[PDB]
Amino acid sequence: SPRPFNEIPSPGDNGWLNLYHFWRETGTHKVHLHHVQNFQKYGPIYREKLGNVESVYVIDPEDVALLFKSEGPNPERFLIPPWVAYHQYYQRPIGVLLKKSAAWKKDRVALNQEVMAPEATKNFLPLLDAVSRDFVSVLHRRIKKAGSGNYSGDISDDLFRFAFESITNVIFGERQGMLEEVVNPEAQRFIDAIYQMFHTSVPMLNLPPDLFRLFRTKTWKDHVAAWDVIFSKADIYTQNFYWELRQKGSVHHDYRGILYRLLGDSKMSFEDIKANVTEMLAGGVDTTSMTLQWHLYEMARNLKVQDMLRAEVLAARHQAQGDMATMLQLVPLLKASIKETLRLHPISVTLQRYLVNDLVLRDYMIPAKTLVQVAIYALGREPTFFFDPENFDPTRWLSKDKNITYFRNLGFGWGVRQCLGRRIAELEMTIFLINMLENFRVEIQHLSDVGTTFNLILMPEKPISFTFWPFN
């Protein structure tokens, strides 16, 4: 029979002492490197209590497979305690992210019909393509202004604005104008608050809420203010749309966006719809933008791969005779390159599931209700699970050797509670990259290795300044 839980290797049983050593040796912002180091110390499985929360950490795709196979109908991941506390104390209506069991399932099913299903997502293409085409126009404009036949700059802020325009366009069916020269300052304030919400989450992460206010008073206050901006503005957007819908009529044969559909025909109350709009808006700005920045970075770092991807896109646009829907079926190397970007640069350091039943992993008995985390960042850099892991190689995902990709594509999670925005995200990034590849060559002057920082979501440790050349 399997060894008991307590035999799983760990730094020890004192959550507070472990937390002390984590902060002193590695730091709150390098949690991803903490995992890498831990697997080097303990082997392919370990357990670690940080503060009051203990998790079993796993890296092997084979163990990942067992975990997700034993998943129940209503999976639970780790809830971020300052987010929970904010919603509870300020009585903020919660969406799919913070719900569980039947209440979660009910929202998820209604939302899948409108954001995941092919019948719905086929409508996103022109809405997303329009925003990407505008982004290209922004860069061409900056090139002309430069007078140099190129443009060099850190475009992270522009990527955030791009991600915002994209998510709002598919939700509201309306352009917010964030790619214009003169921007809406209140919409900019919304974008900034999302980042601030993530950033301020970090100093509170491994603490019960009773300790937040005692030791992180300023951070908690800043965090509360960030969420308040998120909610006040998402509320206004939704409420304005609700009333404008009644002012204009609800007789439309053309596609009007996700919100129109939900308000017009779903099992969701207005309360649930509005809560989920807020979460979709906030979940879609920092995610696709940082991911796309990493993709551009990997293309500049590997010019041969960039050439291959551009050639694939040009051939796809030609064969499809310009049709975007048809193109998206002829660009498998680009799609693989998105998987490759997420393997090296996951947004989420880990995936987590609480066990519903006892489960054996690595001949250790892991009891029901144990939090299990898959160290997705560590997995992506691990040379025993990926050949030459530091190398950006999209063809990796095209192997007929199904062993090479077995439970490796984890950047959007797995199963029924995988990323709700996955289809929006994939479509947005694929279309963005098609437009960029057709229009520009991407380089980085004085290229150097850019590391990663943990700001709740993973992000580049330092700015990346790109150089764009108009492609002929």
């Binding site: 998820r108 995941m116 990709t405 029924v416």
Partner: peptide, 26 residues
């Protein structure tokens, strides 16, 4: 049919990726 016919699980290019991490509804 856990996700209920939306291509958001695998209990029953995009289907190709669900197929790896193992349909009915598609």
């Amino acid at each position: 049919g856990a996700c209920e016919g939306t291509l958001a699980c695998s209990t029953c290019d995009e289907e190709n990726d669900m197929l790896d991490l193992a349909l009915g509804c598609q």
